[PDB]
């Protein structure tokens, strides 16, 4: 009864589409045309960071919003003082093909990973005056694409084997495997309460997962290409996706369908990194066209352009207090914008 | 500025010095990426992830990286490598190799990245050419069953498959068994790319 199972799946998909269409009764542009526009917000490079000698692929801000960690292609993980441009640490990595990096909320550990399929956890606070490898989490089959900390002992990772994983760092074991994607999972984002998380993949889809249950609650499919970036709204009840189709899309979790699309005819390039601002009003998206764009989340109008990078902007992040936006590109340079 | 901040700045300068000396030590290295369908293990010194093979030849250090669909997800990591060593079996499969070369030699990041193409298993192809005609996969040959002529024909649809043959160059070499021959061929190739880079840096070119 393979045809019967296919028909049942098609009927379930049709019922899901019918329920989603029944939920739609007013587009967000209709309820948002009344609010005032944000204007022409212009940000300047208040700081620049030099010292990387290859393409920068990842960065992560700290909870203190002053320490920064950046990963480059020369096998180098640098911890920077953003205020004074001083390099706190220069960790040499075993593998030089690092694609993601994370900073623990407590500030004691930094994670990295990439084509070696291993999530390396580095301890920063030691009795000796050096940074030591604390753990090497292994078990993923494909390349490690994104890692995010929940606490000092738990970390969630995404990979190219179409799965996401939860690790107890002390035991170093696969606590929970998250399954259901078809294409390569490219990015992760964690809810503010650290109980749910969303993953975007190359199958033009995003999935919401419970950390404590290991099951996929909702699947969102609006795009038409590989989703490269993902980020929750500061509310925690919505998220934003960016893909190679030069299109961002804001989904709401309770409405279970797409709420807004951000696109322009002049913008024809992939999207590498998407993050929000503190209030959620402002969305920042890095593109392949050597600069970043700044959209208004409640009305898809391109409010600003952050330009000054001589190569493709590969990563961008926003501080916890929202007073700085740091971008890293392939020109071996980091820039803090405000 | 505080005394602690001054000492922190001095520490940052020391990190700068270590970064500079590491760059000076590593600038004598050549970035090679090994791809194929099929004899990748016959060229290394003639779920894990990458395999790094480091070998030295005539004061050049070379690092080959084995990464053995959706290969475009991690292909941006090798967007600035010196050369791509591609492997292909004459006695192969052939359609898959042609498709892989389609994806590689016309890629966005590899428009100006040189290709060193190896046509390995020459004795196997010599034994197979007399037995099986060329019409098993390419029924357009209509030529002699000589091993040299068969190799020259199979070299096409690989070397003639590229586009924009004025910027990058594809090198062809049947895989020999005289030890220090293939490494010398790769040495000559990377010497050519290094000469081009030096010309561009000096700006006269």
């Amino acid at each position, epitope marked *: 009864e393979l045809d019967q199972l296919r028909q049942e799946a098609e009927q379930l998909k049709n019922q899901i589409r019918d329920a989603r269409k029944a939920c739609a009764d007013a587009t967000l542009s209709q309820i948002t045309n009344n609010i005032d526009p944000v204007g022409r917000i212009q940000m300047r490079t208040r700081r620049t960071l030099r010292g990387h000698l290859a393409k920068i692929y990842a960065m992560h801000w700290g909870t203190d919003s002053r320490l920064l960690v950046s990963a480059s292609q020369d096998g180098k993980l640098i911890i920077w003082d953003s205020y004074t441009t001083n390099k706190v640490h220069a960790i040499p990595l075993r593998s030089s093909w690092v694609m993601t990096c994370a900073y623990a909320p407590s500030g004691n550990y930094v994670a990295c990973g990439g084509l070696d399929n291993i999530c390396s956890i580095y301890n920063l606070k030691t*009795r000796e005056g050096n940074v030591r490898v604390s753990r090497e989490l292994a078990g993923h089959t494909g390349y490690l694409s994104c890692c995010r900390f929940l606490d000092d002992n738990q970390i969630v990772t995404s990979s190219g084997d179409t799965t996401c994983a939860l690790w107890d760092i002390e035991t170093g074991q696969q606590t929970t495997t998250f399954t259901g994607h078809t294409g390569d999972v490219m990015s992760l984002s964690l809810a503010p309460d650290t109980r749910l998380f969303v993953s975007g993949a190359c199958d033009a889809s995003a999935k919401l997962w419970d950390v404590r249950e290991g099951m996929c609650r909702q699947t969102f499919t609006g795009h038409e290409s590989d989703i490269n970036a993902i980020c929750f709204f500061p509310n925690g009840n919505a998220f934003a996706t960016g893909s190679d189709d030069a299109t961002c899309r804001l989904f709401d979790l309770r409405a279970d369908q797409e709420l807004m699309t951000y696109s322009h005819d002049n913008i024809i390039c992939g999207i590498t990194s998407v993050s929000f601002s503190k209030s959620g009003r402002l969305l920042l998206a890095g593109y392949d066209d050597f600069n970043c764009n700044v959209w208004d989340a409640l009305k898809a109008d391109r409010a600003g352009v952050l330009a000054g990078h001589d190569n493709r902007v590969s990563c961008l992040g926003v501080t916890d207090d929202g007073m700085a936006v740091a971008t890293g590109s392939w020109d071996s340079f980091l820039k803090i914008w405000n | 500025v505080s005394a*602690e901040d001054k000492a922190a700045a001095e520490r940052s300068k020391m990190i700068d010095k270590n970064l500079r000396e590491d760059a000076e030590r590593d600038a004598r290295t050549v970035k090679l990426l090994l791809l194929g369908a099929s004899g990748k293990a016959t060229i290394v010194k003639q779920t894990t992830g990458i395999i790094e093979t480091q070998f030295s030849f005539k004061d050049l250090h070379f690092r080959m990286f084995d990464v053995g669909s959706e290969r475009k997800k991690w292909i941006h990591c090798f967007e600035g490598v010196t050369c791509i060593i591609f492997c292909a079996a004459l006695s192969a499969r052939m359609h898959a190799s042609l498709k892989l070369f389609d994806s590689i030699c016309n890629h966005k990041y590899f428009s100006d990245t040189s290709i060193v193409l190896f046509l390995n298993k020459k004795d196997i192809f010599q034994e197979k050419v007399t037995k099986v005609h060329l019409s098993i996969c390419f029924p357009e040959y209509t030529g002699p069953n000589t091993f040299e002529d068969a190799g020259n024909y199979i070299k096409n649809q690989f070397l003639d498959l590229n586009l924009k043959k004025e910027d990058k160059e594809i090198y062809s070499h049947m895989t020999c068994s005289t030890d220090t021959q293939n490494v010398k061929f790769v040495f000559d190739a990377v010497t050519d790319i290094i000469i081009k880079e030096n010309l561009k840096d000096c700006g006269l070119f």
Partner: single-chain antibody, 232 residues
Framework: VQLVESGGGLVQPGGSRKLSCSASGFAFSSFGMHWVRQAPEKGLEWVAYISSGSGTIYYADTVKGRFTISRDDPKNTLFLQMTSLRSEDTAMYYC??????????????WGQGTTLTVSSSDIVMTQATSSVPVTPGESVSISCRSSKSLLHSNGNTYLYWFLQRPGQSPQLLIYRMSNLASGVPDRFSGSGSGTAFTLTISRLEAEDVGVYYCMQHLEYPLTFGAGTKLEL
């Protein structure tokens, strides 16, 4: 982590001696290294400092022109060469490590020290109280005063607290105020501003008896204060 000092002994006035200190258990090359001094019945006094990589060298005014500080990083050793000794140099010498960045813990480990006997402007740190009685289980407040405000423009206040137990090398409790050092129980707290400074012990035990020393790290020559002795 071990800093074992060697040298010392009886030297006639006008003589010379070399003190060595061997470091074993940490990255010696990444730590700035200090020489500190205690007179036999008096408090602490800074002598010298050598940076990581020997880029910056600093001396006290008294030991200037007579004392040389150096390090051998491959040998993991620190050296102090003393020439033209006077009778005011009869003291015990400690060797201290200090790594420097915002959020680090300078002066966090101290050596055992060696005894030298000889025959025959600056921020003043004042601790007026001395030899105050304590009762176990109670709360003790220790005051500390300065001459210049130690609050810098970057928000950092450079007051360091140390504990010299009877017959033991000084420890570190607080490096910047409200920053508690590693290995210290959560009953020590530090609070102050500008000139005034306070250390609070909520519930002291039998292992918290000794002499409490202040230090300023705003500017050299890193003056200490005459400590407060706790007595049961």
């Amino acid at each position: 982590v071990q800093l074992v000092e060697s040298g010392g002994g009886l030297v006639q006035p006008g003589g010379s001696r070399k003190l060595s200190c061997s470091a074993s258990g940490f990255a010696f090359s990444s730590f700035g290294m200090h020489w500190v001094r205690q007179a036999p019945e008096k408090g602490l006094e800074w002598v010298a400092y050598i940076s990581s990589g020997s880029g910056t060298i600093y001396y006290a005014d008294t030991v200037k022109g007579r004392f040389t500080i150096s390090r051998d990083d491959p040998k993991n050793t620190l050296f102090l060469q003393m020439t033209s000794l006077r009778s005011e140099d009869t003291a015990m010498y400690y060797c201290v490590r200090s790594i420097y960045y915002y959020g680090s813990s300078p002066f966090d480990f101290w050596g055992q020290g060696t005894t030298l006997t000889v025959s025959s402007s600056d921020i003043v740190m004042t601790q007026a109280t001395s030899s105050v009685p304590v009762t176990p289980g109670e709360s003790v407040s220790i005051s500390c005063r300065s001459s210049k405000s130690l609050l810098h423009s970057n928000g950092n206040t450079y007051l360091y607290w140390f504990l010299q137990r009877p017959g033991q090398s000084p420890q570190l409790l607080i490096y910047r105020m409200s920053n508690l050092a590693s290995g210290v129980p959560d009953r020590f707290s530090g609070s102050g501003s500008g000139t005034a400074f306070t250390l609070t012990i909520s519930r002291l035990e039998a292992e918290d008896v000794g002499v409490y020393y202040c230090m300023q790290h705003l500017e050299y020559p890193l003056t200490f204060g005459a400590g407060t002795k706790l007595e049961l």
